[PDB]
Design a protein around this ligand. Sequence first.
Ligand SMILES: C[C@]12CC[C@H]3[C@@H](CCC4=CC(=O)CC[C@@]43C)[C@@H]1CC[C@@H]2O
Lengths: 338, 35
Amino acid sequence: DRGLASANVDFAFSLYKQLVLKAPDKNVIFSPVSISTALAFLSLGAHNTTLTEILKGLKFNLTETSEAEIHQSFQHLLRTLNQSSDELQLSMGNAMFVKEQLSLLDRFTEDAKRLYGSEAFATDFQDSAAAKKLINDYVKNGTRGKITDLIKDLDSQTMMVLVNYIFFKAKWEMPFDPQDTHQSRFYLSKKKWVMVPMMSLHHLTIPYFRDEELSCTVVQLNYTGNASVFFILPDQDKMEEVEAMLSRETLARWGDSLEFREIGELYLPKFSISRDYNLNDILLQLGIEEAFTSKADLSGITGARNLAVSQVVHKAVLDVFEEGTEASAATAVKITLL
Amino acid sequence: TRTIVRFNRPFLMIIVDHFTWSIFFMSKVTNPKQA
Ligand SMILES: C[C@]12CC[C@H]3[C@@H](CCC4=CC(=O)CC[C@@]43C)[C@@H]1CC[C@@H]2O
């Protein structure tokens, strides 16, 4: 839990930096914990260099933790995330879609069900359209219709797809009144704006920290339940400077520096954004290489070195509005014969 | 002199779980109306 948080947060910011590097002008929205869980799931079947590259890419310090420690930690995380709750809707699922003829070690299938909650669905990938619809329906069901087209293309020689989804629906602790939402400017740059519905709250007391060293303002808005949002507002033209300082250490400093403050007015756009990603280049920059090559070692899955990753994809959606927030995401790991 | 927090320029959002310290979602909003 302590070491899982630290590794997952390091991974989150490393992932964020590469996404911005790849597409510097774009909105960003993704689920770190979905991607971490999908790749941890994958590592269950990896061996030797393929394995250690994944665990190190996930930012786990292997001199301080072991493979068994990691998987048990993800098992506990998933159990905690899927606990019943009347305050907030939160769920995460894992699944594996396998060609029926593919022979799987009983140890792999058992550990997948036990540690990651995954069933094993027989899938005829040679009927790619049906196989695609089944996987996308699984994700659509898990995200309550929010993630509809996670799998766009599916090679007919696919042997296995590992899938993780996360669904999140929460109410603001202090919700916005829709009668206070009015069209206002959102500045894309100093001289260009777009018009958006700007929600507002008045006379609210919330955690606040003006970070003069980083030229940004940080506020924490709570959801009902154990979830909250850190909002970070860089001064005009300081986004890239703030992004360069994004790290576990910086988030910890922000968190320790929050103090309750009375805010006269808070203005927040009502918005919905969505992004989908091909994570292949990103994961390679993070050191996850052998799983994609002819030297891939996934013999923990089948007992032979006969599988290799072809593609890792991710899609996420974020919906912010007066009553609360809806967000969901899914990650898929596509695997072929080697 | 009251304080005003106005998210009318690009900002970040980090949705976190106080229980597990998981980051559920991380976002940069550069354009709420971006294609
Ligand atoms: C900031 C925070 C306490 C510190 C946590 C943070 C989540 C990310 C993180 C993980 C770590 O392992 C170091 C401390 C931090 C930075 C938590 C989110 C809610 C809580 O306030």
